């Protein structure tokens, strides 16, 4: 009692039910999708640009003064120099993508400005040094040494003023008053790392005093020190710490040092593939070239796993400044920050809100202020009410965070 379908039994299904419009509606839909294809290969519009110039100015350029750049001009490569020798060159040079070579200089130069760690012009066949070139100054530093005013007010990161007061004492007081250090007989600290929960004010307290420095400031991408090519990131961190120590009163901000970090004084450090090239070179140039400097460097990360005790050996890094949560008055200050710049009611109170935000960051406090506005968009409103924020705190904190089972309450009132 299962039966399967014979060939005549197939024809019962396939016939019954609109046998006038079945294929009539179907092959029209079938060949139109064929026709969607047949337009597309028929169109095939795609064309090139290839970046030419208008022929008003290049026709005389396209004369023999292209061949004068073809055959007289050359195709010389660039490299780096390890070192030199005395009274005779015997220079040691890496292509580093090809091999390392022991070469000579060509006759067109003087042996003075062929110093170590320099870009030079290298012959294709005889590999002689043709022209010494600059280290490509300066997009390797000044493109992150922006020297530009950021749009962060001092009143934006209010509520954590004592952690600011730690950082205001460490950074500002030697850079503008190294006089009471002489009047008392002390020297300033020169190492501070930042760690703690994400979205706490790390980049804010960095950028607020980067706004209040009137001076050189450098922000450093953590993945920028990670490179594709082996032996390339160390060469970069060479060029950063050299040309930042040149001018005075500058700040460098390391950020997300998880990729370049890890305890190298402790059990691990079994790495050594282009991460340690960056790492061993920076800890080389962090001390050694810094007794009694002028440029302070700050690190910041979300993971306190990657603390190096060799960094925390004094001379490199001294102080563990971490950030915390606001008690209440810090939070009520922050709610006033993220709600003064939007269409609100003049009668809401914010101390009721920070009661409902026990363990929360200003990232979450900002998220509530945006979410409460989103409830005002749901209805036709243009100003927020009290209950707009009250639904937002319920939507943010009492939904995904560490409190559930609200109806079974009945033990506490």
Ligand X SMILES: Nc1ncnc2c1ncn2[C@@H]1O[C@H](COP(=O)(O)OP(=O)(O)OP(=O)(O)O)[C@@H](O)[C@H]1O
- Which residues carry a binding-site annotation? 196-203
Q: What does the block give as tokens for 262?
A: 């890890």
* Nearer CB in complex with Mg ion: 106/203: 203
Q: What does the block give as tokens for 83?
A: 């070192």
Contact call for residue 249 and ligand X (CB under 6 A): no
Residue selected from 174, 201, 261, 373 as contacting ligand X according to rule CB under 6 A: 201
Residue selected from 120, 129, 307, 334 as contacting ligand X according to rule CB under 6 A: 334
CB under 5 to 8 A by kind: which of ligand X, other proteins, Mg ion, none does 157 bind? ligand X
d(Cα 365, Cα 393) in Å, to the nearest integer? 9
* Nearer CB in complex with ligand X: 225/234: 225
Please give the residues from 140 up to 169 whose contact with ligand X meets the rule CB under 6 A: 157, 159-160
d(Cα 116, Cα 95) in Å, to the nearest integer? 14
Contact call for residue 361 and ligand X (CB under 6 A): yes
Contact call for residue 76 and ligand X (CB under 6 A): no
| Min dist. Cβ of residue 372 to other proteins (A) | 9
C-alpha pair distances (Å), 77 with each of 95, 126, 141, 194, 325 = 9, 12, 23, 43, 55
Sequence ranges of the binding site for ATP: 196-203
Interacting residues of 214 by C-beta distance below 8 A, sequence separation 6+: none
| Min dist. Cβ of residue 24 to ligand X (A) | 29
* Nearer CB in complex with Mg ion: 89/197: 197
On whether the CB atoms of residues 114 and 105 are closer than 8 A, the answer is yes
Cα 141–Cα 143–Cα 146 angle in degrees, nearest 5: 100
Tally Cβ neighbours within 10 Å of residue 234.
20
CB under 5 to 8 A by kind: which of other proteins, Mg ion, ligand X, none does 72 bind? none
Contact call for residue 358 and ligand X (CB under 6 A): no
Nearest one of 233, 247, 325, 310 to 278, comparing CA atoms: 233
Please give the residues from 365 up to 394 whose contact with ligand X meets the rule CB under 6 A: 366
Stretch that binds ligand X, among 70-78, 120-128, 357-365, 371-379 (CB under 6 A): 357-365
C-alpha pair distances (Å), 251 with each of 147, 219, 318, 388 = 10, 8, 17, 42
Q: What does the block give as tokens for 55?
A: 């022929």
Residue numbers at the binding site for ligand X (CB under 6 A): 157, 159-160, 198-204, 302, 334, 361-363, 366
């Amino acid at each position: 009692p299962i039966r399967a379908l014979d060939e005549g039994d197939i024809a019962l299904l396939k016939t019954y039910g609109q046998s006038t419009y079945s294929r009539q509606i179907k092959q029209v839909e079938d060949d139109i999708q064929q026709l969607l294809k047949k337009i597309n290969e028929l169109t095939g519009i795609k064309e090139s640009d290839t970046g030419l110039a208008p022929p008003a100015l290049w026709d005389l350029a396209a004369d023999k003064q292209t061949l004068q750049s073809e055959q007289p001009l050359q195709v010389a490569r660039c490299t780096k120099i390890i070192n030199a020798d005395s009274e005779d060159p015997k220079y040691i040079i890496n292509v580093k993508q090809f091999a390392k070579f022991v070469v000579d200089l060509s006759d067109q130069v003087a042996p003075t400005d062929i110093e170590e760690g320099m870009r030079v012009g290298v012959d294709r066949n005889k590999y002689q040094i043709h022209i010494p070139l600059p280290p490509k100054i300066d997009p390797t530093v000044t493109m992150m040494q922006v020297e530009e005013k950021p749009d962060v007010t001092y009143s934006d990161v209010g509520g954590c003023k004592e952690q600011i007061e730690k950082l205001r004492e460490v950074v500002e007081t030697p850079l503008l008053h190294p006089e009471r250090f002489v009047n008392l007989g002390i020297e300033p600290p020169k190492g501070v790392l930042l760690f703690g929960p994400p979205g706490t004010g790390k980049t804010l307290c960095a950028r607020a005093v980067a706004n209040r420095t009137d001076a050189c400031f450098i922000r450093v991408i953590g993945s920028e020190l990670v490179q594709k090519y082996v032996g390339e990131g160390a060469r970069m961190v060479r060029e950063l710490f050299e040309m930042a120590r040149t001018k005075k009163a500058c700040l460098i901000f390391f950020d997300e040092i998880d990729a370049i970090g890890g305890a190298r004084f402790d059990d691990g450090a079994g790495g050594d593939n282009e991460v340690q090239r960056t790492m061993l070179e920076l800890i080389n140039q962090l001390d050694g070239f810094d007794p009694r400097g002028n440029i302070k460097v700050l690190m910041a990360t979300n993971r306190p796993d990657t603390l190096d005790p060799a960094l925390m050996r004094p001379g490199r890094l001294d102080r563990k400044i971490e950030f915390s949560l606001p008690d209440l008055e810090g939070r009520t200050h922050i709610f006033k920050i993220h709600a003064r710049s939007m269409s609100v009611e003049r009668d809401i109170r914010f101390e009721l809100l920070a009661r409902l935000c026990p363990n929360s960051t200003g990232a979450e406090i900002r998220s509530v202020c945006t979410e409460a506005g989103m409830f005002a968009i749901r209805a036709r409103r243009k100003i927020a009410t009290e209950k707009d924020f009250l639904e937002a705190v319920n939507k943010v904190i009492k939904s995904y965070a560490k409190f559930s089972a609200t109806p079974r309450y009945m033990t506490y009132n």
